Amino acid sequence: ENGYTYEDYKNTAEWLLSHTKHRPQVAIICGSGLGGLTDKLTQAQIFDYSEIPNFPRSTVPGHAGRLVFGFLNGRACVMMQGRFHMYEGYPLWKVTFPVRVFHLLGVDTLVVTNAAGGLNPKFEVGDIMLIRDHINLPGFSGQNPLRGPNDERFGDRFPAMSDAYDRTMRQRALSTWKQMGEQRELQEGTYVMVAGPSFETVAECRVLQKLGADAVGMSTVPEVIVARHCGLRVFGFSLITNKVIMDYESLEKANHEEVLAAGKQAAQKLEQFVSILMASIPLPDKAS
Numbered sequence: 001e002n003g004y005t006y007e008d009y010k011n012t013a014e015w016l017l018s019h020t021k022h023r024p025q026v027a028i029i030c031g032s033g034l035g036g037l038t039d040k041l042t043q044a045q046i047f048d049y050s051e052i053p054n055f056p057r058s059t060v061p062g063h064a065g066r067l068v069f070g071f072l073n074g075r076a077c078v079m080m081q082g083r084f085h086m087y088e089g090y091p092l093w094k095v096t097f098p099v100r101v102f103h104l105l106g107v108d109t110l111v112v113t114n115a116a117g118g119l120n121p122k123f124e125v126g127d128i129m130l131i132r133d134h135i136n137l138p139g140f141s142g143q144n145p146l147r148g149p150n151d152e153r154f155g156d157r158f159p160a161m162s163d164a165y166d167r168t169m170r171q172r173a174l175s176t177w178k179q180m181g182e183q184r185e186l187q188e189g190t191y192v193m194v195a196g197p198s199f200e201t202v203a204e205c206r207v208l209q210k211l212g213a214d215a216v217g218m219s220t221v222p223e224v225i226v227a228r229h230c231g232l233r234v235f236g237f238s239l240i241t242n243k244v245i246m247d248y249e250s251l252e253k254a255n256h257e258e259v260l261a262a263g264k265q266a267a268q269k270l271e272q273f274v275s276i277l278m279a280s281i282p283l284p285d286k287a288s
């Protein structure tokens with residue numbers, strides 16, 4: 001919504017449609033460190049957000065501000081590298097502006113990745129959590145991407161979200177993750193979105209864990225809400241990149257010397273895995 005109108009999204013789509021030979025079926029948003037997925041694209045066309053008519057431009061990081069269209073493993077992707085975050089200052093409706101364009105691009109599935117703080121103790125840095133569900137800690141407050149008036153053209157005024165993280169794919173994913181049989185389990189849980197750019201206190205993590213979130217991060221929910229609101233099929237992962245929770249003993253803090261997750265290897269794993277799943281995303285035109 002706000003800020004943009006339909007015609008904006010349309011133009012944006014059109015420009016991109018009339019500027020890349022590619023029809024992406026799938027959109028992929030990479031969280032921190034899952035940038036590299038873009039390498040796996042074949043026949044990549046890169047746009048700086050930059051060049052795209054309405055696309056929010058990045059707030060600093062920038063290069064890690066790119067939209068690359070590509071084929072990933074039997075699918076017409078379009079991936080965002082460096083998704084936008086509220087805490088950078090966009091409101092939700094620039095954050096999620098792309099999801100709306102990908103729709104108009106034709107994309108019918110979105111897969112969203114983030115990095116996220118492990119709050120379930122079951123979890124070990126490097127883990128991948130497949131997102132079963134989320135808690136929208138900003139939307140409850142007003143900070144929801146679909147807030148202001150609703151374009152019937154993209155979706156219903158009150159989309160449901162109980163089915164957000166599409167179930168079929170949660171399966172193929174869980175199957176697939178055993179298909180190549182790796183060994184720590186493919187995790188699964190609720191991602192709670194928390195906005196702020198700073199990291200949580202211990203009390204904060206308590207409340208988050210006791211709300212039954214398993215991962216905390218700051219992205220995705222808005223993209224997922226706006227995805228689902230125009231019916232994209234969605235799923236995605238968090239790369240657990242750290243965890244805290246207990247008062248006795250800050251032999252440490254909550255920060256970024258813990259958001260590598262072993263480094264490349266965890267991240268690389270998620271990337272393969274995503275690249276693999278390409279294969280499970282139902283084709284569109286017909287598929288059978």
Ligand SMILES: Nc1nc2c(c(=O)[nH]1)CC=N2
Pocket residue numbers: 115116117118194198199200216217218241242243244254259
């Ligand atoms: N809030 C919060 N967000 C995060 C992490 C964390 O430890 N806490 C890691 C990645 N995103």
